[PDB]
């Protein structure tokens, strides 16, 4: 493995919001496949359903649109209509509290899901362990 195996304590029974501490945005997957963040808790595209493919490996799906979160070969997040290898993330505990999501496809590169303070997503190569951008908290919908 390229990464530790500390797992968060939550579960996949309910959908969640993924809140990023960095700028205080919720991860959003828009109908046209765009991925960004918003602080609007009333947005209909921030409700996400996580599911485990293997222990610690997840899909992250928009409940409104059905799209899967995915990271492409240049490190950009996008919404995928179908599950593919780019849609699997290694979900881990971080700093004894937060959830992080590493691209499984790009795990050797340490490419994370992350949000900037201005609510734009991070590109994979601009992410790294230690950043605030990569830290999420799952919140009830």
Binding site per annotation, positions for heparin: 22
Binding site per annotation, positions: 22
Domain ranges of the chain: 1-141
**HEC secondary structure over the chain:** CCCCCCCCCCCCCCCEEEEECCCCEEEEECCCCCEEEECCCCCCCCCEEEEEEECCEEEEEECCCCCEEEECCCCCEEEECCCCHHHCEEEEEECCCEEEEEECCCHHHCCECCECCCCCECCHHHCCCCCCCCCEEEEEC
> Method of determination?
X-ray
Q: Resolution limit in angstroms?
A: 1.1
Distance from C-alpha of 71 to C-alpha of 88, rounded to nearest angstrom: 9
Whether residue 103 contacts residue 125, with contact meaning beta carbons closer than 8 Å, is answered with: no
User: What would the CATH number be for the domain defined by 1-141?
Assistant: 2.80.10.50
């Amino acid at each position: 493995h390229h990464h530790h195996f500390n797992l968060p304590p939550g579960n996949y029974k309910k959908p969640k919001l993924l809140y990023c501490s960095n700028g205080g945005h919720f991860l959003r997957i828009l109908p046209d496949g765009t991925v960004d963040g918003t602080r609007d808790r009333s947005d209909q595209h921030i409700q996400l359903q996580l599911s485990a493919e293997s222990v610690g490996e997840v899909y992250i799906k928009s409940t409104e649109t059905g799209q899967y979160l995915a990271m492409d070969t240049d490190g950009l997040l996008y919404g995928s209509q179908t599950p593919n290898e780019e849609c699997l993330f290694l979900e881990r505990l971080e700093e004894n509290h937060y959830n992080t999501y590493i691209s499984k496809k790009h795990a050797e590169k340490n490419w994370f899901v992350g949000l900037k303070k201005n609510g734009s997503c991070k590109r994979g190569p601009r992410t790294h362990y230690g950043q605030k951008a990569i830290l999420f908290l799952p919140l009830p919908v």
